Curated annotation (Swiss-Prot):
This is Serine/threonine-protein kinase SMG1. It comes from Homo sapiens (Human). It comes from the Eukaryota. The chain holds residues 311 to 462 of 3661 of the full protein. Belongs to the PI3/PI4-kinase family. Serine/threonine protein kinase involved in both mRNA surveillance and genotoxic stress response pathways. Recognizes the substrate consensus sequence [ST]-Q. Plays a central role in nonsense-mediated decay (NMD) of mRNAs containing premature stop codons by phosphorylating UPF1/RENT1. Recruited by release factors to stalled ribosomes together with SMG8 and SMG9 (forming the SMG1C protein kinase complex), and UPF1 to form the transient SURF (SMG1-UPF1-eRF1-eRF3) complex. Component of the SMG1C complex composed of SMG1, SMG8 and SMG9; the recruitment of SMG8 to SMG1 N-terminus induces a large conformational change in the SMG1 C-terminal head domain containing the catalytic domain. Component of the transient SURF (SMG1-UPF1-eRF1-eRF3) complex. Part of a complex composed of SMG1, DHX34 and UPF1; within the complex DHX34 acts as a scaffolding protein to facilitate SMG1 phosphorylation of UPF1. Interacts with PRKCI. Interacts with TELO2 and TTI1. Interacts with RUVBL1 and RUVBL2. Interacts with UPF2. Widely expressed, with highest level in heart and skeletal muscle. Expressed in placenta, brain, lung and spleen, but not in liver. This gene is located in a region of chromosome 16 that contains 2 segmental duplications. Other genes that are highly related to this exist, but they probably represent pseudogenes. Autophosphorylated. It is found in: Nucleus; Cytoplasm.
Amino acid sequence: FSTNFRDTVDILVGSLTQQVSGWLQSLEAFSTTLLGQFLEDMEAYAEDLSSVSLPKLAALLRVFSTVVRSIAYVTDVLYRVMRCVTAANQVFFSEAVLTAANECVGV
């Protein structure tokens, strides 16, 4: 089960997102260290941005929100990091990434 979620995440990171999201949520430590990969990916993309990386960022934000919703001191750190990485990309001004970031921050 530890490696089974990797295939689902990779497939969903590509209208069918609702089915995979529901399956992953109903399927269920490792998440603590797993979120670091996504955090580092967003930070690297934001640093390299300063324009086709927007779909990837939106997909990563959606999968991150789905995995966190499928389920106490690092919450503020992660929230601040997400807010900073989202506010950094203030040139492209894409609505999809903003909507995904808003949903992630809300949850």
